[PDB]
């Protein structure tokens, strides 16, 4: 039934996004404080419209439109929570006794994943039983992650005021890109003529790429480029609490809203559940109001 998958998906995404509120003492995105407030305002508006879509379409049995409203609500709830968690962090770190950290040049988790993915795709291009189709699928993985590595290198170069590091991040990226370009030549040859000799030539051309990946990993792992965690004071933690509590309350009511709506979509002849739905919806709105008020009060700058 249309709407049922959306409700289940929404409840899963809510369960995932609520984890951001458990200990929001490190930055989770690049938004400024007013960036967070802008996002809270925009997502609140979208959510308001979506809650009306949920009720009205469930009431009248417009199931595809119901599913769309559920999906829109879910997206807005996630956007809202990301903004709230970031805002909470910014409030916490703004306390005089809190110690601001510093942003690392390259985000470490996706960096490691990119390197690992390239290494495994290169290994695939090396398997004796690799089908011709698998050459092309491996190539897509190489294409994705080598381009991502180069992008990260340019970002890191922009971020650092060390002229030597600026130049080296660009050079390392060039090595990844040029070794990949050489590999691409051999991939083209192997795809055009699927011979054992061309398989060997492709395998061979993975080596300079693996070396480029390893060399960049070694360079980028310099402790001087690493992130330094924020230290949030107890006062900072107390200051961010009203934002966190309101965001948590909002998600609790939103979960109840979606669960109630899921039932009403199936059977809208249920006056008690309509009241429950209106209660959850108003409590979502109340929680958002309280969060906005708290954000205006606890603003660092």
């Amino acid at each position: 039934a249309p709407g049922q998958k959306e409700c289940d998906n929404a409840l899963r995404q809510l369960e995932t996004v609520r984890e951001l509120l458990e200990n929001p003492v490190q930055p989770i995105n690049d938004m400024s404080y007013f960036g967070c407030l802008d996002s809270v305002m925009e997502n609140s508006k979208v959510l308001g419209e979506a809650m009306t879509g949920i009720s009205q379409n469930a009431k009248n049995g417009n199931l595809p439109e119901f599913g769309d409203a559920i999906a829109t609500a879910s997206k807005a709830l996630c956007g809202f929570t990301e903004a709230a968690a970031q805002a909470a962090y910014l409030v916490g770190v703004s306390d005089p006794n809190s110690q601001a950290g510093q942003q690392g040049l390259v985000e470490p988790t996706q960096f490691a994943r990119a390197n690992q993915a390239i290494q495994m795709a290169c290994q695939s291009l090396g398997e004796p039983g690799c089908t011709q189709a698998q050459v092309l699928s491996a190539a897509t993985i190489v294409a994705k992650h080598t381009s991502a590595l180069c992008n990260s290198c340019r970002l890191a170069s922009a971020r650092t005021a060390n002229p030597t590091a600026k130049r080296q991040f660009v050079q390392s990226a060039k090595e990844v890109a040029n070794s990949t370009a050489n590999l691409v030549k051999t991939i083209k040859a192997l795809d055009g003529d699927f011979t054992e000799e061309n398989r060997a030539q492709c395998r061979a051309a993975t080596a300079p790429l693996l070396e480029a990946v390893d060399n960049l990993s070694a360079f980028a792992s310099n402790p001087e480029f690493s992130s330094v965690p924020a230290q949030i004071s107890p006062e900072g933690r107390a200051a961010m609490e009203p934002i966190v509590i309101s965001a948590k309350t909002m998600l609790e009511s939103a979960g109840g809203l979606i669960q109630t709506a899921r039932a009403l979509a199936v059977n809208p002849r249920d006056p008690p559940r309509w009241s429950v739905l209106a209660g959850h919806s108003r409590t979502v709105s109340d929680s958002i109001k309280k969060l906005i008020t708290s954000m205006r009060d606890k603003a660092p700058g």
Binding site: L136, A143, A177, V184, G192
Partner: peptide, 21 residues
């Protein structure tokens, strides 16, 4: 191979930027 070239279009864009340095 134009299809394989297309697969690496994002990398080509990165190379275009890196070449400027």
């Amino acid at each position: 191979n134009e299809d394989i070239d297309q697969m690496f279009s994002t990398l080509l864009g990165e190379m275009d930027l890196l070449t400027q340095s």
